[PDB]
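ugh ok so i messed up the first submission bc i forgot one of the chains. this is the corrected input, ALL of the components this time, i swear. 221 residues overall. if the numbers dont match what u have on ur side tell me asap before i send this to the collaborators (the ones from the other lab, u know who)
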Amino acid sequence: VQPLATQCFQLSNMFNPQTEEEVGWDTEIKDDVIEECNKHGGVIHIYVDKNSAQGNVYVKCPSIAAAIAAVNALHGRWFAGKMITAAYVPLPTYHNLFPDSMTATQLLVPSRR
Amino acid sequence: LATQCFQLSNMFNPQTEEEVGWDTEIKDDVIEECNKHGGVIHIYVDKNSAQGNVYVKCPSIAAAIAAVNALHGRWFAGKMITAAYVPLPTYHNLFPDSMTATQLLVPS
Ligand SMILES: [Cl-]
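and heres the new structure output, hopefully the right one now
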């Protein structure tokens, strides 16, 4: 079987730390993702892993329904010939990686207006 | 806090320990990944750890960073492995033999 949808997922290929040349690039990715999520079910945690070779972005939505909507809105885009992929993370694993994501309930909004 | 040393987590569970060579294969898998980057000079699969911890030391921090950046977030045995750097002294105290270990490890 495939892992059930959870509140939490990991995006890949969102970027390539070797090629990323713009200052504040990871924040723009963060804003881009939140903006995308706020067209759907929002998001309560996000983390762009600047050092990951596969360009990982971690996300947690206020509900699995919100998470599904975000994943479905995000996993379609392409970057640098590589396609973005989402993988759900079980709560304990995601919570172990991101302890603070456990009690975070506030919907995030983008920095840029 | 990049160092020569890191702790992989979620590499296994007590259920993983029921197959022979589970630890030898995990050991080999990490070495293999490290030898695609900067290699590795010490590894310890902590059979007694509940969190499926594997301890690793690379010949240089450049090597470890390359390994960690390749390993963290990576999926292994259906579980997302996470790498957390281990302070060098901590690693050496936990693992005395890793200090003078300079021979690049190769798989079994
Ligand atoms: Cl997992």
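quick check: The two ends of chain B are 31 Å apart (CA to CA). that seems consistent at least. The domain at 1-108 of chain B is CATH 3.30.70.330 (Alpha-Beta Plaits).
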